[PDB]
Every structure is written in C-alpha cells, then in structure tokens.
Subunit: 148 residues, 3 copies
C-alpha cells in the first residue's frame, strides 16, 4: 500500500476498525442472552432480555452498511478528516442507542433509526465532492490560455 | 482524491449514494409502522402492516451488501459504466419489490430474492475482468518479435 | 483499472466474489423453506426447518459486513495474501456454521458468533499496517 495514500485513509480505517470492534461487542451481548437459557440450538426468542438485545443488535446491523457507505464516500469524495470524525460520533450514538435499547420497561429507544443527522451530513460531503468534481471537470478544464 | 480517479468511480458513487438514500427510505416506512402500532419499545412483531414492512425492509438489508459487492467489483474490475447502470436498475427492482411487499398482499409478491439477474450479471463483469486480467498478466506481455534473429 | 493495482487486490476480489456467491446460496436455501411452507411475512417463530434456516442465514448476513471490513483493511493495510487466505477460511467456517445450523433434530449449532479468530486475526493485520504506517511516517 502506497504510504502516501494510506495516509489519506488511515482515519476512516481507524474509525472503521473501531466500529468493527464495537460491532463484535453488540454481537457478544447477544451471545450472553442466547446463553442464559435454552439458546442451546440458538432459539431466536429467549425473552425480554434476549429479545431486547437481538433486537437492538439487529437494528445496528442494518445501519452498518448504509453508514459505512457515506463514511467513505464522504471520506474520499471529500475531506478524510470531517468524514472520519462524524463517522466517530456515529460510533457514539450507536453505543448510546444500543445501550438504551437494553430494556427494563419504558420506551427503550423505540427507534429502528438513529443518528439520521450524522449519515445525512456524511451524505452531504459525498454529494458535495461528487458535484464539486463535475465543476473541476468542466469550467475546471476549458480555461484556455491561447498565449500564441 | 485524485481528480482523474474520482472520475472513473463517480458513477458507482452516485448509484451508491442513491441506494444509500433509498435505503433510508425503507428504514423510514418501517418507523411509520412501529409508530402507529402504538409500541413502547419495538419488537419485530405486532400487526400485518408493520410485520409486512419490517419484513420487506429486512429482506433488502440482506441484499445491500451482496449487491454492493458486485456493483463495485464489476465497476473496477470492468467498465464503470455498465456496472453503474446495472446497479441503477437494481435500485429500481428494490423499489418495485419493497413496494409490492405489503401493499397488495396478493400471492405473486412474497419472496427473499429480487434481481438475481442483475447481481448475476454484475458478478459476470467482475468475474470478467478478474480473468481477463490474468491474461494481460500472462499473455499481454507476449510478442514473439524477439525471434528477430 | 490500472493493471498493476488490480494485481494487488485480485485476491480479495476473488475471495469476495466467492463469498458473494456463497451468500446467494444461503439466500437460496431460505427460498426453499419459504416455498415448501408458504409465507409473506417471516417474522414469527415458524416452521422449524424454515425457522432454522432463516435464522442461520440472518446470522451470516450480520457477519458479512464486519468481516468484509477487516478482509480489506487487513488486505490493503497489510499483505494482500494472508488477508485473502484468512478471508478464504472464513468462507469455510461460514459454510460449516450455516450447515450445522440446519441438520434436523440433531443439536443444530447455537451461537451466531463465529470464526471469532479469523476476523480477530484479519483485524490484527489491519491494526498492524495501520500502526506500522505511523512509523514510516515518523521514522
Ligand atoms: C477485533 C476483535 C473484536 C478483538 S475479534 C472478535 C472478538 C474479540 C474478543 C477477543 C473475542 C473479545 O473482545 O471478546 N469478539 C468478541 C468480542 C468482540 C468485541 C467485544 Cl466488545 C466483546 C467480545 C468477536 C465476536 C465475534 C466476531 O465475529 C464476527 C461477527 C460475526 C457475526 C456478527 C453478527 C452480528 C454482529 C457482529 C458480528 N460479528 C469476532 C470477534
Ligand atoms: C439523504 C439521507 C442520507 C437519506 S439523510 C436521511 C433522511 C432524510 C430526511 C427525510 C430529511 C430526514 O432525516 O428526516 N432520513 C429520513 C429519510 C431517509 C430516506 C427517506 Cl426516503 C425518507 C426519510 C434518514 C433516515 C435514516 C438515515 O440513516 C440512518 C439509518 C439507520 C439504519 C438503517 C437501516 C436500514 C436502512 C436505512 C437505515 N438508515 C438517514 C436519513
Ligand atoms: C450472482 C449469482 C450469485 C452467481 S446468481 C445467484 C444464485 C445462483 C443461482 C440460483 C444458481 C442462479 O442465480 O441461477 N443464487 C442462488 C444460489 C446461490 C448459490 C448456489 Cl450454489 C445456487 C443458487 C442467488 C441468490 C441471490 C442472488 O441475488 C443476490 C442476493 C439477493 C439477496 C440476498 C439476501 C441474502 C443473501 C444473499 C443475497 N443475494 C443471486 C443469485
């Protein structure tokens, strides 16, 4: 890997490897609940605590992809720094969402979706460069200097 | 990012950002159903409108990854154009499948599949370049002019 | 795409295209069970053959992303070979896990967490170069 390049991605790699690890966690607190009983054949309906976790997890597992998307698209098609930071916050919301979705009655994060703002934003850096590029492509070329 | 490069990917990016947005939709029509279904927390069951939506959605969520795969592999490993268009249709099938799945509840709609032809194709462009590359690696270098004795 | 570059990824592409196809299969053995036992909504603990499959499947579909991640991170950020191989074994565990999580009456494999060691490893190649790069930058 060309040391230069690796430089301008290291952040998204980091953040990604972070989320990669937080992910295995969510997937671990799902083992706890499938174990505390007859999950011995992995019954996908252990109850209250296990149904509350497999739920919270299988809600973050649907977010991962569509997040990673704008995490990079807004990482290459536009500044690898803000893209990687906003992507880091997303790992914070994911924590505080997969957390509150623990249980104990009440409205345990009655949401499937969460950090709408983050991905919305990331998607805006993506849509940013994606456009700004079309400019560098047209009125970026032309600029004819017929200095003959 | 290198202006030239960004150029030969802008389409996959576009199609991708499209699908990213259509995705957020699927996950929005799932919030409507978990909301009217006056729930406290949020279970995977409780209605046929919400159980029909969370289903349609969580069928497209299984497909996103395995599609994104061949969308790019067939986008870099061969033509960024067809790859990007084919991937565009896929977002049309996804629309028409995620739509028929609940509204009609008419036997003809059910199914965890949608667009096997597209991904299959995209996968053929990826398997295309992947091989053709092995040639350029092996035979592309050849040129028996060295027998100019 | 630059023939040189395509060279240093063809492995991860290969393994990936493989897992892409193994994936479509898992998604096929899920069609068989939704067909033999009808349904429009697969969200209530149903047929033990189709509930056993949609489970096994929707257990590998949560793994795909978090695996593909370290598959490449550990493929670019460090050796395209080991990364590609390790990722290959993961496709074998996947087969052996999504297989035992079927059977019949037999103790259908529990725990949807699998190949912990592979991803762990791949994650270490990624965390490898990720750091080693910081040295080449500093030293
Ligand atoms: C990089 C790591 C995390 C150190 S290696 C690793 C590990 C790391 C180890 C060492 C065992 C650990 O932390 O305990 N655990 C377990 C784990 C990970 C993070 C935390 Cl907080 C706590 C426990 C894992 C578990 C699964 C796993 O497999 C991948 C996987 C497969 C299916 C999934 C389905 C849904 C969601 C995530 C999924 N993840 C790889 C690893
Ligand atoms: C342009 C954007 C990127 C869609 S901004 C955005 C938006 C845009 C708007 C409508 C203004 C909003 O924030 O209210 N909604 C809402 C939305 C999205 C698409 C459509 Cl049709 C209609 C409304 C969102 C919702 C979620 C969301 O991300 C989180 C998320 C988490 C888990 C998911 C699991 C499966 C599928 C998608 C998932 N999405 C980003 C956005
Ligand atoms: C590109 C392919 C994979 C070669 S053609 C194909 C195939 C191959 C077959 C069915 C024989 C074919 O298309 O003619 N199956 C099923 C399959 C897979 C392995 C084997 Cl052995 C035999 C049959 C598929 C399934 C889905 C599919 O579409 C993509 C898709 C969409 C939703 C998914 C949801 C969860 C998991 C994976 C998903 N994959 C394309 C194909």
């Amino acid at each position: 890997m060309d040391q230069e390049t690796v430089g301008n991605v290291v952040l998204l790699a980091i953040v990604t490897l972070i989320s990669v690890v937080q992910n295995g966690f969510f997937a671990h607190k799902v083992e706890h609940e499938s174990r505390t009983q007859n999950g011995r054949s992995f019954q996908r309906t252990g109850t209250l605590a296990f149904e509350r976790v497999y739920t919270a997890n299988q809600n973050c597992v649907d977010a991962y992809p569509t997040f990673l998307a704008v995490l990079w698209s807004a990482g290459l098609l536009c500044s690898q720094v803000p893209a990687a930071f906003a992507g880091l916050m997303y790992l914070f919301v994911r924590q505080k969402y997969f957390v509150g979705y623990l249980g104990e009655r009440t409205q345990s994060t009655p949401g499937y979706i969460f950090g709408k703002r983050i991905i919305l934003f990331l998607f805006l850096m993506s849509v940013a460069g994606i456009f700004n590029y079309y400019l560098i492509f047209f009125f970026g070329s032309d600029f004819e200097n017929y200095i003959a």
